Structures are given as C-alpha cells and as structure tokens.
C-alpha cells in the first residue's frame, strides 16, 4: 500500500522466492529423475524493477523462474532405465557453492529489508504526532 512499504514488501517477497529456489536446488543436487522421467534442471529466478508507475525507481518483482542453461552432467550407468543409446544418465547442473552463497546473500538482503521497513514504520509513527 504505502510506497516504501510496497517497496520493502515486494523486495521481501523477491528475496524469499530466491531463497526458496536456492533451497529447492540444494535439495536436488543428487536427484536423478522427476515425475515424467526428465532430469531436474536447476531453477533460477529473474529479478526486474517493479517501477511501472514510479519512473525508473521502485520495488523488485520476480519476472519468472527459468531452468538454468548450463550443460547437464552425465554419468555412465548403462543399466539405468533412463540411460540413452550411449548409456549416459543426465544429472542436474546444480552448483553447491553457488547455491550456498545465494542462500546466505538472500538471507542478508531479507534482514536488511526488514530493518528498513521497521525504521520507516517508526518514522511514520513519529510523523503521526506532528505538532504535539
């Protein structure tokens, strides 16, 4: 609703979405199949500025969630049903260090935005007592 409140809430939502994507990627570092039988392709969120009516500055909105285009890892298990004619099973391209660092940075941004929102709310509470 309130601008800075809108900005901080949108940014909290975006950082929570990034953290959830990173956690799901970290869970699926060793996953070999999904429901359809396709390999799990790592997800990554896309951030975009939410300043549609606010010129060039605004909140951050998650435009989409996209499968990373890094090449899939290949493991030689010719007995696996998912192995192709060459005997290679496709395993996800999830980078463990990148996901851990993403989780940590997203947590820090989340906390910073919460502190910003608290300070702004306190400032309006004090504004509510102008002239008295």
């Amino acid at each position: 609703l309130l601008n800075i409140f809108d900005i901080a809430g949108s940014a909290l939502a975006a950082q929570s979405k990034r953290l959830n994507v990173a956690a799901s990627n970290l869970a699926n570092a060793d996953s070999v199949t999904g429901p359809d039988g396709q390999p799990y392709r790592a997800k990554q969120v896309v951030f975009q500025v939410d300043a549609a009516p606010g010129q060039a500055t605004g909140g951050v909105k998650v435009a989409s969630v996209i499968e990373s285009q890094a090449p899939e890892k290949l493991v030689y298990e010719p007995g696996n049903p998912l192995a192709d004619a060459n005997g290679y099973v496709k395993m996800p391209n999830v980078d463990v260090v990148g996901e851990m660092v993403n989780t940590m940075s997203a947590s820090r941004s989340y906390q910073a935005n919460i502190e910003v929102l608290n300070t702004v709310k306190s400032m309006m509470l004090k504004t509510l007592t102008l002239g008295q």
């Binding site: 969120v45 990373s68 260090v97 990148g98 660092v101 940075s105 997203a106």
Partner: peptide
C-alpha cells in the same frame, strides 16, 4: 533490464 541474480551472473561466461 535485469537477469538471473546471484551465482549465475557473477560467474565468468564465454562471450556471446
């Protein structure tokens, strides 16, 4: 605009 935040962007990539 913007792209993938975090690990994927802050990693060297082949020029394209």
């Amino acid at each position: 605009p913007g792209g993938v935040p975090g690990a994927l962007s802050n990693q060297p990539a082949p020029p394209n």
